[PDB]
Paper text:
One group of metal ion efflux transporters that regulates metal ion homeostasis and can be found in all domains of life is the Cation Diffusion Facilitator (CDF) protein family. One of the most highly conserved and abundant integral MM proteins is the CDF transporter MamM. MamM was recently proposed to function as a magnetosome-directed iron transporter required for iron biomineralization since its deletion abolished magnetite biomineralization and mutation of residues within the conserved TMD metal-binding site resulted in alterations of magnetite crystal size, morphology and even mineral phase. To summarize our results we present an alternative model for the CDF CTD mode of action, in which we propose that upon metal cation binding, the CTD induces conformational changes towards a tighter and more compact fold which allows the activation of iron transport through the TMD.
Author numbering:
A (entry chain A), B (entry chain A): 213 to 291
The structure:
């Protein structure tokens, strides 16, 4: 059930230090696996490097909590 | 002729303060118009806000120089 999984993805991403909401999430099933692409909000005053670190942290947190995800790309934008 | 136009796009983007190369460019014709998506390199120590400013500057510079472009999305990544 896809919406239960999308809710978990958003919730997991929001628990990571430096996340200021989920701006966009597209998730699809490839068989029983999820492939997802996400855009997180960050403080516009973070550096590009810090934003990259937050994205990597989100990728790790979300993939760790949701075992069916087999591909997750995380980008950032000011909010 | 597409490659002449791609070269112009890259050259125009590289002339904008804060651009550290063109990491990716995908350009396609929709009729006689170009639709393009680009990723520029930036200083990892720029803020997210500064990176956004550079992207907007690139969009303005490239669209101003290359009149056939009707859609241009510019994102940034550390280099």
């Amino acid at each position: 059930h896809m919406e239960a999984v999308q809710n978990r993805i958003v919730e997991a991403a929001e628990r990571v230090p430096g996340v200021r909401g989920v701006i966009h999430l597209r998730a699809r099933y490839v068989g029983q696996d999820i492939w997802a692409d996400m855009i997180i909000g960050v403080d516009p005053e973070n550096t590009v490097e810090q934003a990259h670190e937050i994205c990597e942290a989100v990728q790790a947190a979300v993939c760790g909590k949701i075992r069916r995800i087999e591909s997750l790309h995380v980008s950032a934008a000011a909010r």
